[PDB]
Amino acid sequence: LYNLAPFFTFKCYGVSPTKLNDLCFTNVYADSFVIRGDEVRQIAPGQTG
């Protein structure tokens, strides 16, 4: 998925960007939904609305 083409919005805060395969986790939780393209920026924590 790192080299996949049609990924458009790629913005996260959590871990090291390219070192994510070098530190090891315990459990991974995947949350899936559908939202309008206008307020994709709103998904980041910190703001309101």
């Binding site: 790629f10 996260c12 960007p17 390219t18």
Partner: protein, 48 residues
């Protein structure tokens, strides 16, 4: 000692001019809030 503040990218060429999960601004700010404990309080560090 390095002072350059160019956009960090370890293999991500198109990051020039934009940010993302794979590319950030290389710098980040310390909070040093009074409510923060000894585990996060500002420590004067001098390496001799």
């Amino acid at each position: 000692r390095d002072i350059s503040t160019e956009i960090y990218q370890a293999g991500n060429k198109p990051c020039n001019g934009v940010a993302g999960f794979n590319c950030y601004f290389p710098l980040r700010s310390y909070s040093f809030r009074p409510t923060y404990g000894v585990g996060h309080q500002p420590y004067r560090v001098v390496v001799l």
